Amino acid sequence: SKVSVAPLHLESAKEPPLNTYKPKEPFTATIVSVESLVGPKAPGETCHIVIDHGGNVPYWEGQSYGVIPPGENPKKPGAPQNVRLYSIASTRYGDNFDGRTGSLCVRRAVYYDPETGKEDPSKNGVCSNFLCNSKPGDKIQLTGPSGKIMLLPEEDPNATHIMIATGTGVAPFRGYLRRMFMEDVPNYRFGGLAWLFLGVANSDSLLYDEEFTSYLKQYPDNFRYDKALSREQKNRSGGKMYVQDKIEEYSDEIFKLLDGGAHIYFCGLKGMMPGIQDTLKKVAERRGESWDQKLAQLKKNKQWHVEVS
Ligand SMILES: Cc1cc2nc3c(=O)[nH]c(=O)nc-3n(C[C@H](O)[C@H](O)[C@H](O)COP(=O)(O)OP(=O)(O)OC[C@H]3O[C@@H](n4cnc5c(N)ncnc54)[C@H](O)[C@@H]3O)c2cc1C
Ligand SMILES: NC(=O)c1cccnc1
Ligand SMILES: [Mg+2]
């Protein structure tokens, strides 16, 4: 059944924490673990990082932590590096169910010369490689938390939540779904529908697949899960199978859920959105609806939640 989590006083706050720690005086947290989430055929490396904040940097699901990687700011001699934000992939109780850790889902940003494929360490992403290279006991300069766009609307515990992720965009949804299904949170008993769509490059690039598949078996009447593997699947038109093509497969169900008040969430890199918008426009047109008008209504009704970069 549901996992006991502590301390329940984390449910008492009525507002999310924001900017508890700031860049000039970050919280020095400690790495608990770092593990690759992906198999050898994955085009890139994505890691799961567990960080001990000791209960000093609590957060709500959907927020981000800032990390200040070591070194001097290249564009600002004598200054610390700029904060990089990472979507927290854990619930407020964390992966140890104790309110002392938070987790990140971090894609290594690696540079390859577009012609030769060669590498250059001065051009890899600083913070993503810093994090995925970390080992237990390493210290991390933590700031935040920050962000409110992806806070989970809990007013209606029987709401519908349609979660659209590419790659590390799955992070907030791992936290949402643990809160909805895994953890014993007496003041939030989810009885709605949560529907996760995840687009990645191939099967080896899947993130947390075992956890999500387990929810299908534990909460079959409350959870749905669809995956789009761009390099291993092709869409109805011959294009690579992107998450928007999976959305299109369920277009009638999704549009009806939206009309009924479902929340819809988009998270990941911003390049995911143009194809999604194109598909939604096409779906709307086939149904005889204006996607522009529908989207305006979804935004007005606070059903549309996008955090991409
Ligand atoms: C709200 C928010 C949440 C986020 N959540 C996540 C998350 O959960 N997971 C995640 O992985 N990311 C997330 N990101 C992105 C993350 O913040 C970083 O931007 C990302 O990790 C890259 O940072 P970095 O320090 O590794 O790369 P940087 O050092 O900032 O470099 C940026 C890019 O420039 C490239 N580059 C550097 N020098 C050169 C050069 N000379 N020529 C060509 N290219 C170069 C790097 O390879 C890299 O791709 C989020 C962003 C935001 C705004
Ligand atoms: N988790 C992510 O990949 C993410 C979230 C928000 C902005 N950019 C990237
Ligand atoms: Mg795998």
Side-chain angles (χ1 to χ4, degrees), residues 37-39 202-210:
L37 288 170
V38 298
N202 56 25
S203 176
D204 274 13
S205 300
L206 286 164
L207 305 175
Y208 316 111
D209 185 51
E210 301 92 335

Side-chain angles (χ1 to χ4, degrees), residues 97-108:
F97 307 110
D98 63 3
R100 305 189 73 259
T101 80
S103 300
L104 307 178
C105 178
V106 175
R107 183 187 71 85
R108 284 190 188 266

